[PDB]
Structures are given as C-alpha cells and as structure tokens.
Amino acid sequence: HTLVWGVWVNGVDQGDGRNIYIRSPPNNNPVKNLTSPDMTCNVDNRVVPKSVPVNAGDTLTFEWYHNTRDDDIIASSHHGPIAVYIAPAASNGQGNVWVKLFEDAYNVTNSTWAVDRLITAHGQHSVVVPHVAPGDYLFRAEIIALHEADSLYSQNPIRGAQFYISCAQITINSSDDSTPLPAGVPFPGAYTDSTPGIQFNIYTTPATSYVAPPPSVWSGALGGSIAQVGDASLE
Ligand SMILES: OC[C@H]1O[C@@H](O[C@H]2[C@H](O)[C@@H](O)[C@H](O[C@H]3[C@H](O)[C@@H](O)[C@H](O[C@H]4[C@H](O)[C@@H](O)[C@H](O[C@H]5[C@H](O)[C@@H](O)[C@H](O[C@H]6[C@H](O)[C@@H](O)[C@H](O)O[C@@H]6CO)O[C@@H]5CO)O[C@@H]4CO)O[C@@H]3CO)O[C@@H]2CO)[C@H](O)[C@@H](O)[C@@H]1O
Ligand SMILES: *[C@@H]1O[C@H](CO)[C@@H](O)[C@H](O)[C@H]1NC(C)=O
Ligand SMILES: [Cl-]
Ligand SMILES: [Cl-]
Ligand SMILES: [Cl-]
Ligand SMILES: [Cl-]
Ligand SMILES: [Cl-]
Ligand SMILES: [Cl-]
Ligand SMILES: [Cl-]
Ligand SMILES: [Cu+2]
C-alpha cells in the first residue's frame, strides 16, 4: 500500500504532485486484475492540470509514501520488483505504447528486493530522461508486491500479485530526439497469468531464480536507480 507524493528533477523537489501532475488514485489500494483498464494508470486515470518539465539527460525521481510523506513508504512484507515505463501522452496509455525505462527485481549481492531498497531510499527511485521527441509523456512507475503472488487473481480474487501504479505527466522540452521512442506494450495486456514473474512464491523459490515480467528495458533507456536523491525533511 503505497502512492507517489511527487517527483524531483536533478535533485530538486517539484512539490506535492498529488492530483496535480500525478494522476493519483484516491487511496493506496493495489490493483490486481491484469485485464482491467486500472492497469494503465490506476483507478482514476484522467488528465491532471500540470506537467513537470524536464530535459533529456535529467534525473527524474519518483517519491513514494505510505500514509504520510517520508514515512515507512510501503510495508516491508511487500517484496518485489520495480519498473518504470514511458508512453506518449497522446495515447492516454492505450495501445502498444509502453516502453520500459527501468527494471530492478532481486539484487543477489545485497540480498535485497527492489522494494526493500525503496524503503531504504525513503521512497525514491529515478530514471534518466531519454532522448525522445520533445513533447508530453506519461511516466508509469510500477511496484509489484509479491507477498500473495503464489496465487493468481484470475483464479482467486482475494490473492494475487499486487500492482502499485502511478502515472506522472512529464513534459520533455530539450531533447535532440536521437533515440525516438520504439513501439510499446499494452497495459492492460502485457502481463498475463503465464507471464514470468506474475505468479511466484517468494517463500519457497529462491529470489535468484525470480524473473521479472517482460518487456525488457529499452536499449535507448539512459539508466536509473533506487536511491535517495533528496531529503524530504528539508525540501
Ligand atoms: O521457514 C520459513 C517458512 O516460510 C514459509 O513462508 C511463509 C512465511 O513464514 C510468512 O511470513 C508468510 O506470511 C505472509 C502471508 O501469506 C500474506 O498473506 C501476508 O499478507 C499481509 C501483509 O504482510 C501485510 O503487509 C498486509 O497489510 C496490509 C493490510 O492488509 C491492509 O488492510 C492495509 O491497508 C491500510 C493501508 O496500509 C493504510 O495506508 C490505509 O490508511 O488504510 C488501509 C486500510 O486499513 O495495508 C497493509 C499494508 O500496509 O496484509 C497482508 C494480509 O492481508 O504477508 C505475510 C508476510 O508478512 O507466509 C508464507 C507462506 O505461509 C515458507 O512457505 C516455508 O517453506 C518456509 O519454511
Ligand atoms: C477484471 O477486469 C475485467 C476487465 O474490466 C473485468 O471484465 C473483470 O470482471 C474483472 N474481474 C473482477 C474479478 O472484477
Ligand atoms: Cl496487502
Ligand atoms: Cl510542496
Ligand atoms: Cl483490481
Ligand atoms: Cl503527506
Ligand atoms: Cl538510498
Ligand atoms: Cl539531447
Ligand atoms: Cl488484457
Ligand atoms: Cu499493501
């Protein structure tokens, strides 16, 4: 149970984005139904009045929280991967439009899931803005919590992988458009009951055998990390 509070750009807090530049749902409940339109940008997908301006090569940091800003972020039980996708805003997230910019699942050195790392990062994880066409975009940050993913929602609707999905409205201003955005996958559609990483038992299967759901990260993606970039108590 987690939500995005706002974003930072190059380590500068853009301010509370809830219902402003984030297409915020009304609460932190998960999405579980893989075929639902809620998979696109959660349960209240609509245009919100602001977009955050960035330039290619900028660091865009999502900041998540549980109840209040910079709290415990998400329950530590919610082990799982984190991804970020991008689509053009003109799509409204419909169609084969979602391109993966970032994936982190299980880190064998530190023996930590992405979610664990996110808590340590005070809710912050980033992507570097790619060299796509200037214009308006949706960045879709997705946390998958696997604590009840040994069942499939489609078979048992009280269990299933949980998706915490947040779409940010981002305007890319300066960019030379040298890596124009390739085709995308659909949400809903990309994840199905047979997709690797959707049904998994994190209690009896070693985490090293976990494979996150495709698609793979776009070759044109410029990187990203789960790491604190700014201190919410000060700015
Ligand atoms: O040798 C070890 C053996 O381990 C076995 O594996 C076991 C393992 O031992 C055990 O840890 C595991 O137990 C998990 C359960 O299966 C799973 O269902 C459970 O789900 C919890 C979850 O931990 C918890 O975080 C979650 O809390 C929700 C809550 O439901 C929700 O209502 C609340 O909502 C509020 C919002 O948070 C709040 O912001 C808002 O204001 O109000 C909302 C409404 O009040 O949100 C919280 C999260 O914040 O609830 C679920 C239960 O619903 O997680 C357990 C793990 O902690 O089971 C494993 C299998 O039994 C191996 O199988 C064996 O081989 C090994 O030998
Ligand atoms: C899952 O979503 C699909 C598409 O909206 C819908 O038909 C189906 O009824 C949903 N499943 C449940 C259990 O609500
Ligand atoms: Cl839960
Ligand atoms: Cl603010
Ligand atoms: Cl759902
Ligand atoms: Cl708050
Ligand atoms: Cl950190
Ligand atoms: Cl550029
Ligand atoms: Cl579907
Ligand atoms: Cu939860």
Swiss-Prot record:
The disulfide bridges present are 41-167
Q: Which residues are glycosylated?
A: 33, 110
Q: Which reaction does it catalyse?
A: [(1->4)-beta-D-glucosyl]n+m + reduced acceptor + O2 = 4-dehydro-beta-D-glucosyl-[(1->4)-beta-D-glucosyl]n-1 + [(1->4)-beta-D-glucosyl]m + acceptor + H2O
Q: For binding Cu(2+), which residues are annotated in this chain's numbering?
A: 1, 78, 164
Instruction: Name the GO cellular-component terms.
Output: extracellular region
GO biological process entries: cellulose catabolic process
| Record flagged with keyword Glycoprotein | yes
Q: Where does this protein hold O2?
A: 147, 162
By what means is the activity of this protein regulated?
The polyphenol cinnamtannin B1 contained in methanolic extract of Cinnamomum cassia (cinnamon) acts as an inhibitor of catalytic activity.
Task: Tell me where in this chain the PTM Methylhistidine is found.
Answer: 1
Establish whether keyword Cell membrane is in the entry: no
PTM note says:
The catalytically essential N-terminal histidine His-1 is post-translationally modified by methylation to prevent protonation of the histidine side chain, and protect the critical active site of the enzyme from oxidative damage.
So which cofactors does this thing need? Cu(2+)
What residues does (1,4-beta-D-glucosyl)n bind to?
Answer: 9, 47-48, 58, 67, 129, 140
What is this protein for, i.e. what is its function? Lytic polysaccharide monooxygenase (LPMO) that depolymerizes crystalline and amorphous polysaccharides via the oxidation of scissile alpha- or beta-(1-4)-glycosidic bonds, yielding C1 or C4 oxidation product. Catalysis by LPMOs requires the reduction of the active-site copper from Cu(II) to Cu(I) by a reducing agent and H(2)O(2) or O(2) as a cosubstrate. Is able to cleave phosphoric acid swollen cellulose (PASC) in the presence of a reducing agent, yielding a range of cellooligosaccharides dominated by cellobiose and cellotriose.
The family this protein is said to belong to: Belongs to the polysaccharide monooxygenase AA9 family.
**The protein's name:** AA9 family lytic polysaccharide monooxygenase A
From what organism does this protein derive?
Panus similis
Gene that this polypeptide is encoded by = LPMO9A
